[PDB]
């Protein structure tokens, strides 16, 4: 018999990279802001990515972001820092 296999690769790549993160809804509202500024600014500063936030009603603590990885990675690292910061309590955490 003959398997007939090959050893070649393909240029499988995607322009847009959808990355999700684990964040509570209690923080979302805060991150988003009153007029979607805290988020709007980040979307621009980073480049112009899109961020999707779940509705408290549904009960989903997951966020979906769209855009170029190069930026997505920046928008994510920014959301994490803030999300955590927002949480006001005794003994803050530096980063």
UniProtKB/Swiss-Prot annotation:
Domain annotation KH: ranges: 24-89
Q: Which residues carry this modification: Phosphoserine?
A: 8
- Superkingdom: Eukaryota
Where found in the cell? Cytoplasm; Nucleus
| Task performed by this protein | Appears to play a role in cell sterol metabolism. It may function to protect cells from over-accumulation of cholesterol.
Which protein is depicted? Vigilin
Annotated organism of origin: Homo sapiens
- Which part of the complete protein is shown? 645 to 726 of 1268
